[PDB]
């Protein structure tokens, strides 16, 4: 079964550039490759077939190239409507196989998140579990690092981070951490901290409240 | 046009098995043949077999055989992919694609799970913390213990947009899902302006709405 290796897997570039993606054969494919792009929310599309030959109204700035075992996909100007998932897939011999994908996304300055935290709901303490909710929005790039804290002691296996896609308009991302208590032992312990740390800061900021339910 | 109509979605039990179906509208199998592909929650592409009717044909990848079985009905222009023994490893989204992979179906998304349809549970999520109006402030809905997807989160019945973050769900370890919809307002608003979130989930039939007010929090 002939393996198509990927690359890159992740990549940032700006409105009109020249990006190239590659996809290497373990076996001689020869010419019997295509190249595929998954738009956000799940729309697939067929942008080129035999390694280099487009698809009948797929803009002329794709085109397919080859270099040994190595085939590339390259976009001349990088549209908007370019930043999707792009696969290759082999169809020389079966099984029929694909490549890892590259998520290419829109590249702009470094923001510095806008941080936040949510202490539980009375009304959800009665029910036992204790969520608590520390919200970074609108930065870039998505890197970011959520240490929560109680009276300083660090938690761990206890938070799920869940971030946004990247805005249409002004291309930042939006995460949320989530920790998770019971109301037994979120009642035993009164400073729970948020420590962000991000490119865009200089320190790691931390926002915090003292357990006194309101 | 032309295009390959797939089935709904789908929520079985581990154990059991599932059918899928995509009909193909003008091209039919015998010239436009089908290839089923697999895609787990925010996975890549994974080739599961495909279909050669005319040929009698039908070729799978080694790590499907026997767990995925195509058929095809000439008369109807449908493939049907066939997933048995299934478990947690088979919660996808499964897609179709005809001959050359020219034509891309929808997708169908698979759900594996032991648990059951599960009204959420909205709570607020409460501004003024350490706060009292002035600059910016942020406050949110926090929709969790649902099943399955998804929910519908609204501000405001629509009037509020700007500003609202609807975080993709969160599966929890009891199986259950979550996820929360934080809005950015103006601090000066926060007491001369209602902020409700309308969360929606129609396997349950639920249909909330959390007011959000500032605590002195």
């Known amino acids: 079964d002939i393996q198509m290796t990927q690359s890159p897997s992740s990549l940032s570039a700006s409105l009109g550039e020249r990006v190239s993606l590659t996809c290497r054969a373990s076996?001689?494919?020869?010419?019997?490759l295509g190249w595929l792009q998954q738009k956000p929310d799940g729309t697939i599309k067929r942008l080129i077939y035999?390694?280099?030959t487009l698809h009948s109204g797929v803009p002329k700035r794709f085109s397919g190239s080859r270099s040994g075992s190595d085939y590339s996909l390259t976009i001349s100007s990088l549209e908007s409507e370019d930043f999707a998932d792009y696969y290759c897939l082999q169809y020389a011999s079966y099984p029929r196989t694909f490549g890892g994908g590259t998520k290419v996304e829109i590249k702009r300055t470094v923001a510095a998140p806008s941080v936040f935290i949510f202490p539980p709901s009375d009304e959800q303490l009665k029910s036992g579990t204790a969520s608590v909710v520390c919200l970074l929005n609108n930065f870039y790039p998505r890197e970011a690092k959520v240490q929560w804290k109680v009276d300083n002691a660090l938690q761990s296996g206890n938070s799920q981070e869940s971030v946004t896609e990247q805005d249409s308009k002004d291309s930042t991302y939006s995460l949320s951490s989530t920790l998770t208590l019971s109301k037994a032992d979120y009642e035993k312990h009164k400073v729970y901290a948020c420590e962000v740390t991000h490119q865009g800061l200089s320190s790691p900021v931390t926002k915090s409240f003292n357990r006194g339910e309101c | 046009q032309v295009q390959l109509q797939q089935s709904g979605a789908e929520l079985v039990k581990p154990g059991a098995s599932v059918k899928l179906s995509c009909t193909a509208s003008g091209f039919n199998i015998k010239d436009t043949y089908m290839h089923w592909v697999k895609q787990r929650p925010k996975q890549g592409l994974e080739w599961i077999g495909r279909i050669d009717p005319a040929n009698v044909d039908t070729k799978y990848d080694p790590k499907f055989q026997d767990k995925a079985t195509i058929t095809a009905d000439t008369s109807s222009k449908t493939t049907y992919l066939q997933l048995s023994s299934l478990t947690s490893e088979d919660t996808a989204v499964y897609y179709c694609?005809?001959?050359?992979?020219?034509?891309w179906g929808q997708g169908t998304t698979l759900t594996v799970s032991s648990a059951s349809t599960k009204g959420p549970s909205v709570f607020p999520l409460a501004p003024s913390s350490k706060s009292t109006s002035g600059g910016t402030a942020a406050l949110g809905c926090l929709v969790k213990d649902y099943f399955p997807e998804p929910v519908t989160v609204s501000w405001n019945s629509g009037a509020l947009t700007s500003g609202v973050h609807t975080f993709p769900a969160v599966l929890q370890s009891s199986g259950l899902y979550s996820l929360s919809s934080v809005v950015t307002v103006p601090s000066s608003s926060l007491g001369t302006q209602t902020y409700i979130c309308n969360v929606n989930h129609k396997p349950s039939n639920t249909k909330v709405d959390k007011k959000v007010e500032p605590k002195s929090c």
């Open positions: 694609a005809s001959y050359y992979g020219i034509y």
């Open positions: 035999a390694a280099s």
């Open positions: 076996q001689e494919i020869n010419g019997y």
